[PDB]
Structure 1
Amino acid sequence: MKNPQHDASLLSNSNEFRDKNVEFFASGGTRTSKFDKLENHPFLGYPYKRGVKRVIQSHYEPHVEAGGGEDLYGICIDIDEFSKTATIVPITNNFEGYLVAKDSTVKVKDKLIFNKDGALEKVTINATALTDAKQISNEVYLVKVAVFGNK
């Protein structure tokens, strides 16, 4: 989850101001402009920090889920669990931030493609990696990228 709410018994020492931002709970983007277009959409699963595709079908309005390829629609940069809604940056808008990488093979200067699970994998091209993949926890790898569209 984006913010796993767990109670603690001791305070965690947090004084160093470096290597503090690469975390799974840091939503949004590293650099954001006031004129960035944002859309909230109903979602299924957990597409947080992943490429999202718009799925269209009691009939319901279209929702979004993790995906990519020819069906890529945007990027989910923030999520709200109570409302079950996800803030999405459309693919027509450039973005800079940390996204989910398939594995640790991704390095700097690497051109990346959103796979069927919304994860960034090495090689149409969509983004250019800026840093190496870092393991946040278990198999979760986060990579800083500069999304620019589709080739």
Structure 2
Amino acid sequence: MKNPQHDASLLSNSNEFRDKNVEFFASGGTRTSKFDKLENHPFLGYPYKRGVKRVIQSHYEPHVEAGGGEDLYGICIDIDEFSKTATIVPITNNFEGYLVAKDSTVKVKDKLIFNKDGALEKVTINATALTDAKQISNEVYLVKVAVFGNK
């Protein structure tokens, strides 16, 4: 989850101001402009920090889920669990931030493609990696990228 709410018994020492931002709970983007277009959409699963595709079908309005390829629609940069809604940056808008990488093979200067699970994998091209993949926890790898569209 984006913010796993767990109670603690001791305070965690947090004084160093470096290597503090690469975390799974840091939503949004590293650099954001006031004129960035944002859309909230109903979602299924957990597409947080992943490429999202718009799925269209009691009939319901279209929702979004993790995906990519020819069906890529945007990027989910923030999520709200109570409302079950996800803030999405459309693919027509450039973005800079940390996204989910398939594995640790991704390095700097690497051109990346959103796979069927919304994860960034090495090689149409969509983004250019800026840093190496870092393991946040278990198999979760986060990579800083500069999304620019589709080739």
CA offsets per residue over residues 17-46 of structure 1, 9 Å max, x none?
Answer: 000000000000000000000000000000
Shift of 1:78: 0.0
> Could you state the TM-score of these two structures normalised by the residue count of structure 2?
1.00
Where 2:98 maps in the other structure, the secondary structure is strand
Q: Distance in 2 between matches of 1:94 and 1:31?
A: 11
After TM superposition, the runs of 4+ consecutive aligned structure 1 residues lying more than 4 A away are: none
Partner of 1:90: 90
Structure 1 residue runs of 5 or longer lacking an equivalent are: none
Q: Distance in 1 between matches of 2:48 and 2:133?
A: 17
CA offsets per residue over residues 44-64 of structure 1, 9 Å max, x none?
Answer: 000000000000000000000
Q: Distance in 2 between matches of 1:50 and 1:78?
A: 10
RMSD: 0.0
CA offsets per residue over residues 75-94 of structure 1, 9 Å max, x none?
Answer: 00000000000000000000
Where 1:52 maps in the other structure, the secondary structure is strand
Partner of 2:16: 16
Structure 2 residue runs of 5 or longer lacking an equivalent are: none
Partner of 1:35: 35
